[PDB]
Structures are given as C-alpha cells and as structure tokens.
C-alpha cells in the first residue's frame, strides 16, 4: 500500500534563513543544536548532491540506532528538499521506503511554515505503524525547535 | 493550518459494484448493515448529488451525536465521491472542515482499492487531533467491512 501524510508546522524564523540552517547545513547543525537527539550525520556515498547517501546516527536509548537517507533533490529557489528513507529506522518488516518532501514557505508576518510530506510504501494490505508516524512527528518537531532556538540566540548565524 | 491524510484500502468487491453499494446507496445500506456504527442518514437538502447536505446520526455512547456532510461531486464513470464534513462530530474548537475525496479503482484480481484523501482545515498553528484520524479510519474500515459482508451474502444486490 501507499500512505501519504502532509503536515504544516509554523516557525518564527524567516524562510530563507531557515532553509540555509535546517536544510542546507543540517548535517552540521543538527548534531550541534540537538546532540541529545542526533549523534552524527555522515556521507556514505556522494557529496551532498542528488543521489548522495547519508547516515544519521541516534544516541543509545532511542528506538532506532540509525537511518540512511538518499538525497533526491535540493531546490534553492523554492526552498524544497526531497529525500528518501531507505535503510534503518522504521525500514523493515512491512515498510520498504519513506519518500519525503520538506518545503519551507515564507508567511506574511515574516516567519515561515514547513510543509512536509511523508509517503510510506508498505507491504500489500499492511498499514503504517502509527507509533512510528507519531515518533517521526516528535523527532522532527524537536529538531526544528532546537534549530529555531539556536538561530534566535545567534543573529549572525545563517545571515 | 492544513493537514492531508491519503490512504489505500483493499476490497474484494469489484469497483463498479462497490461504488453502487458503498457510495451510491450508502444512505440506505449503512444503518441496515452497520447499526452499531451508523443510526441514520437523512438528506437535509437534495437527494444525494452535488450540493446535498446529509445528517448522519451515530449510536448512543459514540463520542459524537451526528455529523453534517455536504456532497461536493459524484463521478459515476470514474467512481469518484467528494464530500465535506461541515458540522457536528469533530467540527468545532480548532477544526473548521474536513474535505474528503474517495476514488475506487479496479485491481487485476477482480477486486478494488479505495483511495481516500482527508484534508483538515485547522485553526492557525493547531494540529489535527490524532484521535480524530484514528476514529475516521476505524469508522471507514467498519463500514466497508459491513458492506462487503452484505454484498458477499447477497450476490444479486447491486450487480
């Protein structure tokens, strides 16, 4: 089966700056601002460009040890990041892939919204494990607020 | 905000027949085959086509007493049914409307798949209540299963 979840999350950070921090410098910023949630991010294969395989490791005690993501597209004009979750994390049993899109959209007040899509490919009639979707929502919200807080404390970062 | 959920549900019933029974005659069938889920369905306006407002009443002890749904489109050839939840049920507090799109498609084995999209309009930063998503999905499954069982017991119905 295929299950698709599209969400919107508000940020007080301007879209261009948040895109630079959260997407373009995520590999460096995530372990820095949320070290208790992200142990490391490393390139397994490639540069950061389309096709690149990246391994994200999590601290001991978390439900998963690591995940491997494949970078699919990075659109700097439209602040859009497409990637696939292809190994580790929730991949296994009846889940083969998660195809993700993150689009950071400016709002009239000068902040932004993260428009996020998660497309799950499950085996046949099986449904997405609801508590993985929930945990995924929580991990992403934690990273976002940690990035926000860092940016608000460091006005010179990602100008 | 806007939240969108897209699911796929397998049915053993051929697409044309499932559309006839589950969509086109649901008002009649649901209270008869699933009285534990649906108490009644009544047209407040129209007779089932676009613009029709229907009141769906639930059994005693359900979280909600009723919902009002507006029929948006009904495609008899492509087996599409679009409708919106506009009053009662989860509508209130931070949720204004749920816009639903159902598409029934044939599968090679002679059965069908229901492709279902639910778009929630929430107030500002507020999230869609996860328990409403579970409840909506569980309701759909229950009704589909009741209609399936009825159709398999009555081979002359909607054929």
Residue numbers in the entry:
A (entry chain A), B (entry chain B): 1 to 159
Task: Give excerpts from the publication.
We hypothesized that this linker density is related to the observed redox dependence of the dimer. To test this hypothesis, we soaked crystals with β-mercaptoethanol and subsequently determined the crystal structure at a resolution of 1.63 Å. Residues 5A and 5B were no longer connected, but the linker electron density apparently vanished upon reduction. The resulting electron density at position 5 could be consistently interpreted as cysteine. The reduction was accompanied by a reorientation of the neighboring Phe3 side chains in both monomers for ∼170°, now partly occupying the position of the phenol rings of tyrosine observed in WT Bet v 1.
